[PDB]
Amino acid sequence: SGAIYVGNYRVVNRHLATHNDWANLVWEDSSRDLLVSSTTAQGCDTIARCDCQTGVYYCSSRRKHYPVSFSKPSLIFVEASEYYPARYQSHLMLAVGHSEPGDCGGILRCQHGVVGIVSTGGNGLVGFADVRDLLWLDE
Numbered sequence: 001s002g003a004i005y006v007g008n009y010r011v012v013n014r015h016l017a018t019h020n021d022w023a024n025l026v027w028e029d030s031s032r033d034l035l036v037s038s039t040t041a042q043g044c045d046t047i048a049r050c051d052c053q054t055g056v057y058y059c060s061s062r063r064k065h066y067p068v069s070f071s072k073p074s075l076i077f078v079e080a081s082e083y084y085p086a087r088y089q090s091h092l093m094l095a096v097g098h099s100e101p102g103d104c105g106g107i108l109r110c111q112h113g114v115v116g117i118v119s120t121g122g123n124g125l126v127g128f129a130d131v132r133d134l135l136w137l138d139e
């Protein structure tokens, strides 16, 4: 689990979005595994605006943050899960690291702020759904 809170927006994994997230839907992209809902309380997170390829992510299944090198956001095939069919996920970044399903929503951060959230894993890789292209999150 995990979300990003910026302005009046809550960013979550689309597959973990709650009934209240869907009741307050602003934007969703199935191909990206993202959903943004509206919040009443102001959020304090800053979104990174950069092309960093190094950062730190929170891994709940290890109660640890790991530093990682990650690929630029791209269209990658993701094996079917208990939340998705075997499909092509867009705006996805991969690193070598530990990820289990429950690690989804872990934040990946660089010096500029939030880069993305854990979205995929397995085979010793962790996949992060990029948010740095969603400029509207900061207006």
Ligand SMILES: CCS(=O)(=O)NCc1ccc2c(c1)OCO2
Pocket: 015, 016, 017, 018, 019, 020, 022, 023
């Ligand atoms: C992540 C597990 S969950 O059960 O809390 N949310 C999934 C969900 C399923 C159907 C929905 C919905 C939300 O909102 C509209 O219809």
Ligand SMILES: CCS(=O)(=O)NCc1ccc2c(c1)OCO2
Pocket: 054, 055, 067, 068, 069
């Ligand atoms: C030295 C072994 S490693 O390279 O596999 N450690 C992970 C790592 C990845 C990116 C980093 C970093 C550490 O610190 C700065 O950026």
Ligand SMILES: CCS(=O)(=O)NCc1ccc2c(c1)OCO2
Pocket: 080, 081, 082, 099, 100, 101, 102, 103, 104, 118, 119, 120, 121, 122
């Ligand atoms: C084959 C195992 S599975 O059917 O549960 N889905 C793959 C998976 C593994 C690790 C994850 C993940 C999804 O999302 C975050 O880290």
Ligand SMILES: [Zn+2]
Pocket: 048, 049, 050, 051, 052, 110, 111, 112, 113
């Ligand atoms: Zn950065």
